[PDB]
């Protein structure tokens, strides 16, 4: 039930989590390859949480609204400065998507961290439970907390061009404010980069 996760100097507590969904691996692969010549360093100051707004769940939305965002998104803090001050870098992800409703709102919600994609057709939605996923069901839980490692074609990636992961939500069953439930839900996210490495330095202005 109760579960407290901590990344860096930031924490988070949830009292209804149904577990963590490790995806595609438990540990990361070898991070000192032959391409970087050993000129790579591991920054630890940039493994803290940060937040964003996805959308607002509402009764009008039928099955199949996804509203996906691709990340690494723009970042005010430290991790946002690394892609500006370094060429190649790699990092996993540790998401947490929260939708606080009520004990009495029926409906469902599916969230999965899928690899590289731009758009999904309506037929492929029925098969979204192949990627690391978790259901948000307002009768029981309110947080997802998927946990995926870095994966890509080549070892170190240039985040100015290739965005490998893409957090995807989806309304499996419509919201129903039957009698006493909250009129609408506002979905948020609590992503946090984990295990960030970085190599190759830029000349400033």
């Amino acid at each position: 039930r109760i579960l407290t996760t901590r990344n860096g100097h930031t924490t988070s507590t949830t009292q209804s989590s149904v577990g963590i969904t490790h995806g595609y691996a438990t540990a990361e692969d070898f991070v000192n390859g032959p391409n970087t010549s050993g000129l790579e360093t591991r920054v630890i100051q940039a493994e803290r949480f940060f937040k964003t707004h996805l959308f607002d769940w509402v009764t009008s939305d039928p099955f199949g609204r996804y509203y996906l965002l691709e990340l690494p998104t723009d970042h005010k803090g430290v991790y946002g400065s690394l892609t500006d001050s370094y060429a190649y870098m790699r990092n996993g992800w540790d998401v947490e998507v929260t939708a606080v409703g009520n004990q009495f709102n029926g409906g469902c919600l599916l969230v999965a961290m899928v690899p590289e994609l731009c758009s999904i057709e309506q037929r492929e939605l029925f098969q979204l439970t192949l990627f690391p996923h978790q259901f948000i069901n307002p009768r029981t839980n309110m947080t997802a907390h998927i946990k995926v490692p870095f994966v890509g074609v080549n070892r170190y990636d240039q985040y100015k061009v290739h965005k490998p992961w893409t957090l995807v939500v989806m309304v499996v069953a419509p919201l129903t404010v039957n009698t006493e439930g909250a009129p609408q839900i506002k979905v948020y996210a609590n992503i946090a980069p984990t295990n960030v490495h970085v190599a190759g330095e830029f000349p400033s202005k």
Binding site: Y24, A25, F30, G33, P34
Partner: protein, 45 residues
């Protein structure tokens, strides 16, 4: 091992037959199928 069905070693060497692999320093989805919970979750009668 794919559609390879001869009991004689191929005439050509291994390195000329195909690209030799290199090491540094189904695997995962088969670990998932074995983790599958199958027992009863309640008290049987």
């Amino acid at each position: 091992s794919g559609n390879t069905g001869s009991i004689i070693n191929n005439y050509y060497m291994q390195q000329y037959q195909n690209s030799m692999d290199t090491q540094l320093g189904n695997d995962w989805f088969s670990k998932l199928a074995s983790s599958a919970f199958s027992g009863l979750f309640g008290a049987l009668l």
